[PDB]
Symmetry: C5
Subunit: 273 residues, 5 copies
Amino acid sequence: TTEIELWLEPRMGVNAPTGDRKEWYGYSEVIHHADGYDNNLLSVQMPQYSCARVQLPMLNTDMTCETLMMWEAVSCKTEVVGIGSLISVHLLEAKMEAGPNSDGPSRPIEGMNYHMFAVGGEPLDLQGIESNGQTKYATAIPAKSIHPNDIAKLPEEDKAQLQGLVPKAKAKLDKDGFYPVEEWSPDPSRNENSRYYGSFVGGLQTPPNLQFTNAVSTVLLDENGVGPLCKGDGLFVSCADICGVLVKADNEAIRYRGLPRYFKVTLRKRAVK
Amino acid sequence: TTEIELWLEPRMGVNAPTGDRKEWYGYSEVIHHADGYDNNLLSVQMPQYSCARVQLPMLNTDMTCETLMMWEAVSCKTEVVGIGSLISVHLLEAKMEAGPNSDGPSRPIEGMNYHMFAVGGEPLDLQGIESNGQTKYATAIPAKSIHPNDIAKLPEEDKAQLQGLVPKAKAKLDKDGFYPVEEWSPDPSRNENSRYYGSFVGGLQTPPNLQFTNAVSTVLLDENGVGPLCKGDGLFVSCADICGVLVKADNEAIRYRGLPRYFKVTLRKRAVKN
Amino acid sequence: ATTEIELWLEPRMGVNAPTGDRKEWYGYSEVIHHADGYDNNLLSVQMPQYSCARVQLPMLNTDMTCETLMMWEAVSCKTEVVGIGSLISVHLLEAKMEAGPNSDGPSRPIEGMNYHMFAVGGEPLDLQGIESNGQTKYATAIPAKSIHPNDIAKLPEEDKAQLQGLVPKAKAKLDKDGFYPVEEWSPDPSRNENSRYYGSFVGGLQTPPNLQFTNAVSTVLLDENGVGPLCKGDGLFVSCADICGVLVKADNEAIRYRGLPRYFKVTLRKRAVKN
Amino acid sequence: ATTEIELWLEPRMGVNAPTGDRKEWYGYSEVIHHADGYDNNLLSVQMPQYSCARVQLPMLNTDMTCETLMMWEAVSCKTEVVGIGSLISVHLLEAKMEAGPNSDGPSRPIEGMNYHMFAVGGEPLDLQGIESNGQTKYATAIPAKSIHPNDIAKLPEEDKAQLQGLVPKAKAKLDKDGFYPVEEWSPDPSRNENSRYYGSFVGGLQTPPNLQFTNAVSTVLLDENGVGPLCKGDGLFVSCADICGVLVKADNEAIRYRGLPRYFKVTLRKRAVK
Amino acid sequence: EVLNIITDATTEIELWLEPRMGVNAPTGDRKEWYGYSEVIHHADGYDNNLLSVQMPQYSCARVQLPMLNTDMTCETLMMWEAVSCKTEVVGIGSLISVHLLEAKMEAGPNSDGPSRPIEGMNYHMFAVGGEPLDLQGIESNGQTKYATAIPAKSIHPNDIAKLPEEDKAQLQGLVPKAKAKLDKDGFYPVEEWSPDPSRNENSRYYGSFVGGLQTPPNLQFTNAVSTVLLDENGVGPLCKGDGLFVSCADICGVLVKADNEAIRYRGLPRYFKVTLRKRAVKN
Ligand SMILES: [Mg+2]
Ligand SMILES: [Mg+2]
Ligand SMILES: [Mg+2]
Ligand SMILES: [Mg+2]
Ligand SMILES: [Mg+2]
């Protein structure tokens, strides 16, 4: 038996409280309707998956032996923190929800809620897609994010295929704040050594629906009673928690809002062949 | 136990990234309110079911034996991929969700959500229906789609019957991207060797509600512990996943949007009476 | 010992046949306005009704005088609303456009009130009558095209406000297809001891319709003592009503209800009873 | 050994009888305006109330002084709201039309607040008082048409803001039908040991009413020790309240609450007690 | 070290927790709005200082249980173990009111219709533990201006983390130093403090949130359900010092002012009934 705790901070676009965008950590950069067509869509405008690898106590001195020991993740407790902050109606720079001569409340955080968490023994497998195959993305050296066609490398005239399923558009979630949610999803064709759980509610004004409790556990064992086996004695957790949007007052454009997620994974030892 | 994996790409109307409509693959053609009355409704304006038959390993050397082996589908995992892409508020040509002089976001994908998947040992049985019996449909040779009255062959003065249940309007889901969702539904009076599961949320602005996970399975065994029996060593898989609509900015017409679905079907060998 | 029974029930939303002047709106209701029943007489074609049918089962007993008889017992059923995919249409005929007045957008889809109920019993489903407005004016026909609670209760005109509560005399059996309007009749929970009914309702004019369809789900009809509905006279009685929303006309924004057909598959067994 | 009990509870939305001047709006409330209770005295007919009734059961004991006595024990119940189909009406008398000003569209259907609760017990249901506005003005008549929390707590006027929280003195028994308003009284969870109540609430003015009806479902009334409500005095007490939405008037856009009758079927058995 | 249960070994506890939406007492100038928050405007906290009365807070209370051990230096002692509890929000029916004082009218400009009912954000949580509930701090806006009084009427996450002004944007993520214990009624704002899942090993909390300004409130109430407080090992919270700690917060929606369309939060009281048993422990 053993237990592992850690926090995953949100990666909505502004992924660090530094630089010019310092004051909007935990948010995305402002997004307009023609972005990606009038201009190049920035990394800071695309909410990304969070990820982390935890080094577990190394179990095998000689890895050449036929019978080895491995950490097996049996269950997990996970929770999104800071949900109470979403009741705010005094949001900075946010649009007022009232008539022209009023002094009413600001728009609260509302809209798209995308929530996923994953526990596995190796990086999460991702499948790429594009809502618009010809969306213009900015490029920097080094790269601040990675998009499906950076791997599939289809000709520019063939990028409409990315609106369906491109088998070459696959990747591993091997870097935090690097894979945009709107382009990558957990790959159901793989992820045999991982468990992921996701839900999505669209719309711009949809009421956010979130729960939080410390009395619920997610069992990670499969039908055979075997959970994720941590290769290299590494535990891989990943998440994504878009909780809604903020509506700017001046031009009504939006930023996504994310919240931190907590993990407590319970592991046992298993002998493998 | 053997597992079979495959993807079913969406057939919303623009069913291939080729031609003039190449850039809107995975979407439908633009739809206006008077389409089908002011003109002929196009096949690219009607989302259709996706289907595929998978050839399984041949099991029998002689089909006249009283006892034969058949592949039995016992369970399945299925998932709609690309759900995170539905958060986009920078959609091409989409209507802006803000005031007249603003520079706000675009409408995200929202509206009708029609999600169904099916696993069987033979093509899925379909039942035809029309919301408007007198809807005008375009015709090409060869046909790009098939409609209920193409089989029922009712006189034009009797097509209002298709707004109810016309028993002669039956078909098998035997062609990918051919049977429109708005005209064909899984036939509950048949499909004894298939299992289908469907859900529908209407409206044009409804927030889409979707889930994705790899820790959930659907048991395909019936009350007698028998799953679909693959006739001719063929596993038949069907789906249709309308995830909402995109609203044009210039004239506010809509395109349906669909997403690919994945299948992992678990099968075993069963001996049956012949 | 065992038998299965299949049948369809076509919707009875008002226009109950693809014949006559209203032929093209079979499966819909007649157009309804806010003052109908007040400035004019409300028509039966404007009132969705329950669908019902009696299925003749194989005869079980020869001498009906015998002390011990045999009855068919419905144990389970599968039921499904077919044609749900047609509700995605945004090109509905004569429908209001869902966009700015100077656009060329889609039509309003079928949305709004969803009233879904099905029933299986050994006798006609017992109904209880009610009125949302006691003084609603209903058209009169001989023979009648529909029946209303006061046709049975027969209260004086000045006492019809009682029908907005519960009038015990306002009771009937669902004994005629396309005859008992939904807005006036409900399953009677004070009876129906030999029937099983399951119903749900979601109101509003713009509510998104929420419907499911599958063939891997059954409904067990046995009660807490393991007894299902016993078919009297060797007759199986099925009932249903499936309002899936409304259509909004473009010219004056009035509405029509819309329904879809429902399928039944009931499994029955033989059961001995005392006469 | 075992008995069954049936009874109907008619709604007490304000107009609590099909007699008098407000005869035609039985089953509804009186019209409610925003400034009512401030511009005037709020009427009892403007406040939906709980229904209740005591059902006399067969007498069991010839001497209430014996150490061992028999009592009726309610083990399970079947309850249903009737008339749900009537909520589809879009031709409500005097109701606001939901269409453009030049149109001839349908009326507003019944929608908005849904407050549904039923209770079964061996004695009157215990209630706890509250006020959303402590200084609400209530009309007075002799005999009283309803009762309010401060009629029992008897706080001075300048301290009535306490009733916007928890005032322990504002307690009462549901001992009179069409007498205790819903907006002032809730079931008291600090008591009601000999009762079972089940309630739900969806607010707002335009929320779609969501209701179900079936005769295949029962509610078990036993507690964790397998004991149900014991009927003191051989009397069974049932209570309810079923606000199903509001009607909006066309002329001033004010509202009436609308309720529906509720049916009860309670199964009882004989139990010996000390 | 938890041992076995001792089989007068049980007891029951009841109490009410009144809402602390900001106006936390029916006294003073804000007396008439007890159970509500103070009026809130969009630019509050930016062009002025946000007040304690404008920030709904958690309710909490300690219940003194019967003393179990006379000699606290004994090797084997006994503690109260909370096994289950019933909890209920009272006054839910009051939320049907459409004649709310000073509330905006929901009708056309020349009409006389109903007021807006209570609707909007719903935040409902309750917690039962053997010690104060652990809290984790956060800020929706890092630079929100908060009014300060001596003594303080509420506490904010940066009062503990003590970050410099140019680093308060970290409070929009997870600042580990911003932790506290729910040890004071009407003092910890809901919009800044959440139950800390990295701690609270001796507490059980259950919460849900539905946002938006016009969302229909959805609440239930019944006396026929219990919440089992035992963990996976069959051990409920152990009450250190024979003290039972109950916490809650029940924002049920907002009231919209008619004159300027600004809002007040509204809360309702919550009831608790905790069942406890005697559990042996090793000191
Ligand atoms: Mg695989
Ligand atoms: Mg069949
Ligand atoms: Mg009866
Ligand atoms: Mg008590
Ligand atoms: Mg810990």
